[model samples]
Target: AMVPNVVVTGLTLVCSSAPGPLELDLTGDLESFKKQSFVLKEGVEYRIKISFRVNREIVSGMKYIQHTYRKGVKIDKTDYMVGSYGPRAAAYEFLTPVEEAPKGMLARGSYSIKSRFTDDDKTDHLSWEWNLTIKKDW
Candidate 1:
């Protein structure tokens, strides 16, 4: 078992009370989905994005960045993965990052993630995704 760098942290998911193109509501308590797990392919590049749902404008809620890597037979890795978080607008505060396991081989098991938010100006709702692949490690 190899422990790689590039850790995933503070992963959160949110949906909109209404629903549409970008409107979303950040869902709390991922522990409810203990039986759920996301699968990722062996080799690929993923981007992490955070979107904070204040009112209508989307803002960024991430300070640091993260990547994913699964143990695969392939030597050369490609970059084609993307995860998003936070909001992207002016006059928005109280955005944060997520917590996840190491960036390699989260396969064949149950995983849990934690999400956080800032106390910035009555935050309405927020949402984010791993936006990664799902695969088992050999």
Candidate 2:
């Protein structure tokens, strides 16, 4: 199937009194990206990839490593497609299958969404809470 353009639908970052890095929650609609929700199973093989670029301009002298991830797992490494970074882009893919969804009081259950970026001098992060109601093909 053909994939459509995907973008951030919504996001929220909150800091707790417990002391820790702020938690980020993001929500996106794949209707623009996949046209429909993709389903997966624990042990079922599948492939997933995502790529995005810097949509804006920023100050110079900043170095950053872009990363693509899902459910707290580093699915892709942080590397630049060119000599410059920030206002940069990233892409990643995984060929293995998931063992199971996240569990035990973790961000509204498994099937969550998340991603991050980091560099020697700075770090940027994005996250999402996905609700996967669809069943997989086993």
Taking all chains together, each candidate's TM-score versus the true structure is 0.31, 0.30
Q: Which lDDT tens digits does candidate 1 get at residues 1-138?
A: 332111222342222221222212234554443334444334323323344333333333323222333332222222221223333333222223332323455443333332333333323232232333334441
- In the order shown, the candidates' Cα RMSDs to the true structure are 13.6, 13.7
Model 2 lDDT per residue over 25-82, tens place:
2244423322222333323322222233343443233222334344567554444322
Q: Pick the candidate with the highest TM-score.
A: 1
The local distance difference test score of model 2 is 0.31
For candidate 1, what is the lDDT? 0.32
Candidate 1 regions with alpha-carbon error over 4 angstroms = 1-25, 28-30, 56-111, 119-138
lDDT of 2 at 103: 32
